[PDB]
């Protein structure tokens, strides 16, 4: 039970996906005792997994598993392996390490629709949950994706068997996807998503508190959010509950 | 004893109040071995307490108690409970969990002077230290408070039995209270406080290092500061001692 | 071995120097199991050492030593001790605590060339590795140092027996040394360094990810970097390896 349980009001709580960019192992064990109940998935950011000791990676995945949290490596790592013709070795290693999900992305590389479709299907066939990601890392490339382009890709990924589709904003949440150079949500672009796709299948990267607030006020506390800093999981739950100033009386 | 004890010069050290927005329990135990000697009070930010496991909350309060640190829940949580007519249940739970203090605020809700006075007195009557808070969360509301308004409220709260009064700046320290949109201290507004209230009874929220520096240079190292990030307690003590560049030779 | 070891490509990896501004002791023990292999040196920032319990300082130095990491106190602490005529007591305490290196700087105080030369030599004579630092803490003083001034001081310090010379940018990485008010690298100033000094003897403070990216793209992954946040050591290694978006395919 929570402290002040008498104040709790039941609600439809969206997904929380954390960015883990290299948390220490015992720290993860400790940390989950405070906020493990509010984490659904964790991304080991980009290629961070590939720099960490193999047993430490396995260890961490188990700690998350003790709280029912599925872990995936970043799509950037998939893209690196894919570009080297080592996608199979990538899936095999993922299975051996214990990742329950994989992210398929094309943020840093050119992957055709057919290649993308087939990578999703191969990952699914191997028993992984699959999250895809729509967006490009670099602003010159990302700018070439219109909102209608993003919508088409979301539904393409779902058709291929993706479980969820992530809308990219990077850890910075600046100048990429739905966010302008100052990190403010592009309201018009976001409306065109709200009316064209199944929002329950979409996860919005929202690393900044101001972004989390904007998404909660627009879609409700049922909104799915990703790239949540590990130390803002509790904050995010308070925002969903109207127990932080930004959403008090508004949720 | 401290390392390099021969360099230490005794001084009048103001209060340090930390923002704990959800630190893990064993981490707190470990963390206090480094900087517990420089923490007076800790705020479990806003309604964070109300999302955390009850035994974990109790556990953390005890760890802080082992270093002589008093803990209070955020005034935002008080405001939520108060607005639901559950202030009594709120005080009872606070006592059961072990909080030694409570924050009374009106940052997100309308609380009249009489209601405010009576809430302070009720908390005091129940054995809590009471810290009040002056300010509004949202800039449209906060702007309506003039400096003279803030001064009047400080002394009203003290009259009611408040132990300390906190000047609100939020965790961001931007666009609220004494800080402009860029987080810079409003020097003129601050002078009008320096000459009209007992500064020893006031605690300034100062989440940004630049704010801590501004307050130390204005009032001295005896200044009371709040919303100090957990990982900047040591930094803050070095600033008070002139052992970081910003205050070297100036304190 | 690392996870996804089959993706690893050997490369010339520059130094990583971490800023430790007060990490808890058991946290350090845990933290090094994830990224201790990618840390060469750690700076206990400025005078932080002088506020921490002496046995905790010794304890931490040992944890770092278990991963082959040398620790030094900040040059600001040296400057304080030096200004009080307690440089000898400073070196003795450093030896007793277990620091394997010392930083000699003049960021907050006036130290002549002869005084600087002699302090370097005294530290070396006492068995310390010596890192010096070029730059001033305050922008009004730092602006008076031209690039040619910095180059001359680098080689002066090396002549005196310095092991490395650090180019100062502070923890903020703003408005000081090679960085403008917005934290962007001054490309022209940096070119004049690239062509005039032994870059292998220089360590660039680069607290911001954007700075780390700029230095890696300019000098390569062999570049030496300092003031790396403890939680960005893994990120930095991924950047060196082209496994984060910013340097994917560029390294």
Residue of A nearest to B47 (CA): A243
- ∠ CA A114-A117-A120, rounded to 5°: 145
| Chain C CB contacts of A135 below 8 Å | none
Q: Reading across the β-sheet that carries A202-205, which strands appear in turn? A: A70-73, A41-44, A16-20, A225-229, A202-205, A164-167, A129-134, A101-104
Q: Do residues A177 and A167 make contact, with C-beta atoms less than 8 angstroms apart?
A: yes
CA B235 to chain centre: 17
Query: C14 to each of A51, C53, C102, C121, C231, how far by Cα in Å?
Result: 15, 33, 20, 26, 18
- How many domains does chain B divide into? 1
Q: Which of B12, B39, B55 is nearest to B236 (CA)?
A: B39
Query: C32 to each of A27, A43, C35, C229, how far by Cα in Å?
Result: 12, 21, 5, 14
SS (H, E, C) chain B: CECCHHHCCCCCCCCEEEEECCCCHHHHHHHHHHHHHHCCEEEECCCHHHHCEHHHHHHHHHHHHCCCCEEEECHHHHHHHHHCCCHHHHHHHHHHHCCCEEEECCCCCCCCHHHHHHHHHHHHHCCCEEEEEECCCCHHHHCCCCHHHHHHHHHHHHHHCCCEEEECCCCCCCCCCCECCCCCECHHHHHHHHCCCCHHHEEEECCCHHHHHHHHHHHCCCCCEEEEEHHHHHHHHHHHHCCCCCCCCCC
Contact between chains at C138 and B33 (C-beta distance less than 8 A): no
List phi, psi (to 5°) of C185. Answer: -65, 135
- ∠ CA B145-B147-B229, rounded to 5°: 85
Query: A77 to each of A50, A95, B17, C90, C143, how far by Cα in Å?
Result: 8, 15, 42, 47, 42
Both structure tokens of B163: 């132990």
| Nearest-angstrom CA–CA distance, A16 and A18 | 6
| Nearest-angstrom CA–CA distance, C200 and A136 | 34
Q: Do residues A78 and A49 make contact, with C-beta atoms less than 8 angstroms apart?
A: no
**A182 interfaces chain B, CB cutoff of 8 Å:** no
Contact between chains at C48 and B246 (C-beta distance less than 8 A): no
**C105 interfaces chain B, CB cutoff of 8 Å:** no
Q: How many CA atoms lie within 13 A of B138 on its CB side?
A: 12
Residue of B nearest to C136 (CA): B245
Both structure tokens of C107: 């960021």
Q: Do residues B166 and B130 make contact, with C-beta atoms less than 8 angstroms apart?
A: no
Read off the CATH number of the domain in which B153 is found: 3.20.20.70
Q: How far apart are the first and last CA of chain A?
A: 22
Pick A46's closest partner by Cβ from C5, C8, C245. Answer: C245
| Nearest-angstrom CA–CA distance, C77 and A174 | 37
- ∠ CA C204-C205-C211, rounded to 5°: 90
Q: How many CB atoms lie within 10 A of CB B4?
A: 25
Q: Which helix (H) or strand (E) holds C114?
A: helix C113-125
Contact between chains at C51 and B234 (C-beta distance less than 8 A): yes
Helix (H, G, I), strand (E, B) or coil at A19: strand
Q: Which class for A166: exposed (0-12), middle (13-18), buried (19 or more C-beta within 10 A)?
A: buried
Both structure tokens of B154: 């400080």
**A246 interfaces chain B, CB cutoff of 8 Å:** yes
Contacts with B43 (C-beta within 8 Å, 6 or more apart), sequence order: B17, B18, B19, B20, B71, B72, B73, B74, B103, B226, B227
| Nearest-angstrom CA–CA distance, A65 and A79 | 25
Please say whether the dihedral angle defined by the alpha carbons of residues A246, A247, A248 and A250, taken in this order, is positive or negative.
Answer: positive
Q: Do residues A185 and A211 make contact, with C-beta atoms less than 8 angstroms apart?
A: yes
Q: Which helix (H) or strand (E) holds A133?
A: strand A129-134
Look at strands A101-104 and A129-134 and give their pairing. parallel
Q: How many CA atoms lie within 13 A of C74 on its CB side?
A: 29
- ∠ CA C172-C115-C112, rounded to 5°: 65
Q: Do residues B78 and B108 make contact, with C-beta atoms less than 8 angstroms apart?
A: no
Neighbours of chain A (3+ CB pairs under 8 A): B, C
Q: How many CB atoms lie within 10 A of CB A98?
A: 15
Query: What single-letter DSSP state applies at residue A230?
Result: G
Both structure tokens of B221: 């190292």
Q: Do residues A207 and A227 make contact, with C-beta atoms less than 8 angstroms apart?
A: yes
Nearest-Å Rg of the Cα atoms of chain B is 18
Q: Do residues A214 and A179 make contact, with C-beta atoms less than 8 angstroms apart?
A: no
- In which residue are the tokens 């406080």 written? B193
Q: Do residues B249 and B19 make contact, with C-beta atoms less than 8 angstroms apart?
A: no
Q: How many CB atoms lie within 10 A of CB C191?
A: 12
Q: Do residues A85 and C33 make contact, with C-beta atoms less than 8 angstroms apart?
A: no
Query: C52 to each of C59, C101, C227, how far by Cα in Å?
Result: 11, 18, 20
Q: Reading across the β-sheet that carries C164-167, which strands appear in turn? A: C70-73, C41-44, C16-20, C225-229, C202-205, C164-167, C129-134, C101-104
Both structure tokens of C133: 């630092």
Query: What single-letter DSSP state applies at residue C128?
Result: -
Question: Within the 144-173 window of chain A, which residues sit less than 8 Å (CB to CB) from chain B?
Answer: none
SS (H, E, C) B170-233: CCCCCCCCCECCCCCECHHHHHHHHCCCCHHHEEEECCCHHHHHHHHHHHCCCCCEEEEEHHHH
Q: Which helix (H) or strand (E) holds A44?
A: strand A41-44
- In which residue are the tokens 């070095």 written? B238
Q: Which helix (H) or strand (E) holds C122?
A: helix C113-125
Both structure tokens of A6: 């008498």
Q: Do residues A60 and A23 make contact, with C-beta atoms less than 8 angstroms apart?
A: yes
Contact between chains at B7 and C79 (C-beta distance less than 8 A): no
Q: Reading across the β-sheet that carries B16-20, which strands appear in turn? A: B70-73, B41-44, B16-20, B225-229, B202-205, B164-167, B129-134, B101-104
Q: Which of B102, B119, B192, B195 is nearest to B156 (CA)?
A: B119
Query: C151 to each of B183, C140, C145, C194, how far by Cα in Å?
Result: 36, 19, 10, 10
Dihedral over alpha carbons A152, A154, A157, A159 (to 10 degrees): -70
Q: How many helices (H) and strands (E) does chain C have?
A: 10, 8
| Chain A CB contacts of C23 below 8 Å | none
Both structure tokens of C198: 């032994």
What is the nearest CA distance from B158 to chain A, expressed in angstroms?
Answer: 25
**B107 interfaces chain A, CB cutoff of 8 Å:** yes
Question: Within the 14-43 window of chain B, which residues sit less than 8 Å (CB to CB) from chain A?
Answer: 21-27
Residue of C nearest to A60 (CA): C34
Query: What single-letter DSSP state applies at residue C247?
Result: T
Residue of C nearest to A82 (CA): C7
List phi, psi (to 5°) of A58. Answer: -60, -45
Neighbours of chain B (3+ CB pairs under 8 A): A, C
Q: At what angle do helices B87-97 and B113-125 cross, to 10 degrees?
A: 30
Q: Which of A192, A219, A197, A132 is nearest to A167 (CA)?
A: A132
Q: Which class for C108: exposed (0-12), middle (13-18), buried (19 or more C-beta within 10 A)?
A: buried
Torsion-angle region of B175 (φ positive above 0: left; ψ -120 to 50: alpha; else: beta):
left
Query: What single-letter DSSP state applies at residue C230?
Result: G
Q: Which helix (H) or strand (E) holds C72?
A: strand C70-73
Task: List the determination method.
Answer: X-ray
Q: Which of B61, B42, B41, B40 is nearest to B52 (CA)?
A: B61
Q: Do residues B141 and B175 make contact, with C-beta atoms less than 8 angstroms apart?
A: no
Q: Which of C150, C159, C249, C129 is nearest to C205 (CA)?
A: C150
C223: containing domain? 1-251
Q: Which class for B149: exposed (0-12), middle (13-18), buried (19 or more C-beta within 10 A)?
A: exposed
Query: A54 to each of A24, A96, B67, how far by Cα in Å?
Result: 13, 10, 38
Q: How many CB atoms lie within 10 A of CB B104?
A: 29
Neighbours of chain C (3+ CB pairs under 8 A): A, B
| Nearest-angstrom CA–CA distance, A65 and C60 | 31
Helix (H, G, I), strand (E, B) or coil at A14: coil
Contacts with B141 (C-beta within 8 Å, 6 or more apart), sequence order: none
List phi, psi (to 5°) of B216. Answer: -65, -40
Dihedral over alpha carbons B173, B177, B180, B183 (to 10 degrees): -20
**A90 interfaces chain C, CB cutoff of 8 Å:** yes
Q: Which of C144, C206, C132 is nearest to C174 (CA)?
A: C206
Query: B200 to each of A15, B150, B192, B196, C143, how far by Cα in Å?
Result: 45, 16, 15, 12, 38
Q: How far apart are the first and last CA of chain C?
A: 22
Query: B188 to each of A231, B192, B218, B222, B226, how far by Cα in Å?
Result: 36, 7, 12, 20, 21
């Amino acid at each position: 039970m929570k402290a002040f349980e008498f104040l709790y009001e039941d609600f439809q709580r969206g997904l929380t996906v954390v960015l883990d960019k290299g948390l220490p192992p015992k720290f993860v064990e400790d940390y989950l005792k405070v906020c493990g109940d509010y984490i659904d998935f964790v991304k080991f950011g980009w290629g961070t997994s590939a720099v960490i000791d193999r047993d430490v990676v396995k260890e961490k995945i188990n700690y998350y598993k003790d709280w029912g949290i599925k872990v995936y490596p970043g799509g950037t790592l998939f893209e690196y392996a894919y570009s080297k013709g080592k996608f199979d070795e990538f899936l095999n290693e993922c299975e051996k390490l214990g990742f329950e999900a994989v992210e398929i992305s094309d943020g840093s590389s050119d992957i055709s629709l057919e290649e993308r479709n087939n990578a999703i299907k191969r990952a699914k066939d191997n028993g992984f949950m699959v999250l895809t990601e729509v967006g490009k890392k670099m602003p010159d490339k990302d700018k070439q994706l219109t909102i209608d382009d993003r919508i088409k890709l979301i539904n393409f990924d779902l058709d291929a068997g993706a479980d969820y589709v992530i809308i990219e904003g990077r850890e910075s949440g600046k100048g990429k996807g739905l966010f302008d150079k100052e990190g403010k949500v592009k309201e018009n672009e976001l409306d065109v998503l709200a009316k064209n796709v199944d929002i329950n299948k979409v996860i919005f990267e929202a690393p900044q508190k101001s972004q989390q607030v904007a998404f909660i006020l627009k879609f409700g506390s049922s909104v799915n959010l990703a790239n949540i800093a590990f130390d803002e999981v509790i904050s995010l739950e308070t925002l969903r509950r109207g127990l932080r100033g930004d959403t008090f009386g508004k949720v």
